[model samples]
Target: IKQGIREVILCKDQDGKIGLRLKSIDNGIFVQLVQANSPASLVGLRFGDQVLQINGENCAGWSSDKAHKVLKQAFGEKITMTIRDRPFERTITMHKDSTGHVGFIFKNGKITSIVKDSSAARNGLLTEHNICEINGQNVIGLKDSQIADILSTSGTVVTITIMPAFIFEHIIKRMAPSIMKSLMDHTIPEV
Candidate 1:
């Protein structure tokens, strides 16, 4: 898994919005969200991309609020970002058996179990991996029930994009307050 670094230039919209959201984790600012069809999305900014520099200024220890301030102040001028891709992200395709089982148990978007000799096991879906996308659709902010519905409705062949649970948990914890509120409300109770 080779990591790549790229530069992205963003131009604010008429409303002075770039349609990108930032979050801070362990003193590193990361791209949290990019609205579809927005300048950031159009420029290929992605979730989990660590912002290394802003307009040639080192942002290694910048807070989320500081980044936002810089971006807002740069309106009317192009904002340049040096971004590094997140590592350990993997996408795997697996075929379900006749019993409609993918052979894994998931809760809160994290895989908790993988049946022996099952499709999940054979396809490299390991326990403790967090499912980020299902069949090309993003499921990061969705509830477990919602994610389950998506999986059940998806055809036998499914493509899943996952990352380590630790990373996923950190990202979730740093999400916007509105999103975090909904996630907290949908928390699954332990048996």
Candidate 2:
């Protein structure tokens, strides 16, 4: 408990994720993991960094669950947490099938890219798809590495359900011009 204390502001990214794995051990809450491209990683929260305060609430002798609660409540809002910082390496899981291929690159828990000739592209997978499930398992809140663990271990068939990004794009594309046209018609007075 007698560690150097510091404060850092944490923000969730566009994906509504801050990418931190927290744990409490030996009577202190600590940052157990940090994901790439996430606010936690961007803010330089390395592994084993002891979290002392969340949103200005003292975490001294606080439960890990309490820390998690604060973080969960702080989602979509900026928050500050005090910490005893330390730098460490974090490993990630990657999936490759028996044929030495899985053919997907994940960015922030979504499939950012896929090999053109790989099984994923051939299997109706698309880029920008938000991976939500794997093999009937909910992967909604998991990191790409965590999801990769499932994909890698689920054998030859990895059932990954993705939420397509195009639906909103299509709705906006189809509605914006129509709304503008209707507005124009109403304003132009049939001229």
Candidate 3:
């Protein structure tokens, strides 16, 4: 898929809101937050995605103060961001069946079976579907317990995406889908 820098313009009530909470590490400036309802949120920057450039200026080795200054100065102006995002690893939307279950089982990260008329089956889930995301959170590399922890309180209408064993192992490597994290958690383990 195509990926590149994007721009967001601040105007009106969003005028002074750049919506980034930056943290410094090794003198590198990275995106910390695209504050909600602020221009930053509207701009589409979320989580800790690193920032490379702003308004055509290189941000390498910059401090939080420096980054904020650049953004504040650009109030009401369009800011161009060169950023990097995480990747994705899953197969289908998971919804709760009338019984409050997604209706599938996993064994060693493989789809063991699916309950008939379960939410998982009703949503186009297959017999061999792999469990990747729980309510849109990626589960790769997460311990089985960790995955379970997220699922336990997932509530109704959990959204899940998975891939078959063969495709995930062979094809996803080459396809390099863009990393997407659950909005609830920034870092998710890889399967």
Candidate 4:
């Protein structure tokens, strides 16, 4: 399972920004493989894929605030991903889709994010996507933070079905549409 690797570095998206990053090489944090069928499916997150970093903070150097920042900033922006596909390193330019999400985050190192305005988030989706399912089926890992990253990356919409947090969690589902409405209410997109 060793790839003769050492040290970690930030990912350059050809534009000079740290689009993604890798740390500890093949260490667990460097590469995370998400299950098939989650929001990542359409989003481009997949198995045997290297996660490297969320935003700027390398997963190998995972921190609380830094991780969250990555999540928020990446919520509606294009994501530059770096992975070792074999032989030579490959760069993945993932575009966000209306239904696609990055994946979920967790305390056990898992979580997911929903699109900013989608049906799933509107229905009260509280837990991760794959780990939580619809109609009682075990599903893909989906978390809010991950949702934010994907949406930020793609400039897409999000939807939820439930809430798993305190205060906002309880009403997030009901308030999701309004949130979008509020966003539109103040945007030039209307023109």
> TM-score winner among the candidates?
1
Using lDDT as the measure, what is the rank order of every candidate, best first?
1, 2, 3, 4
lDDT of each model, Cα atoms only? 0.74, 0.58, 0.56, 0.32
Task: Report the Cα RMSD per candidate.
Answer: 6.5, 17.3, 10.6, 15.8
Ranking by TM-score: 1, 3, 2, 4
Give me candidate 1's TM-score against the actual structure.
Answer: 0.77
State the TM-score for model 2. 0.42
The residue ranges of model 2 lying beyond 4 angstroms of the native Cα positions read 1-3, 87-191
Q: What TM-score does each of the candidates earn?
A: 0.77, 0.42, 0.45, 0.24
lDDT of 3 by residue, 135-176 (tens): 644465455677667767778767666656654443233212
Off by over 4 Å in 1: 152-156, 174-191
Per residue, candidate 2 scores C-alpha lDDT tens digits across 88-160 of 2111233455676768788755568888677776665667765544654435445567667777667765655
Candidate 4 local lDDT, 35-71, one digit each (tens): 2222233333322234554434456555434543564
Q: What is the lDDT of residue 51 in candidate 1?
A: 84
Separately for all candidates shown, the number of backbone clashes (residues 3 or more apart, or on different chains) is 0, 0, 17, 53
Compared with the true structure, model 3 gives a TM-score of 0.45
* Worst 10-residue lDDT window, candidate 2: 182-191
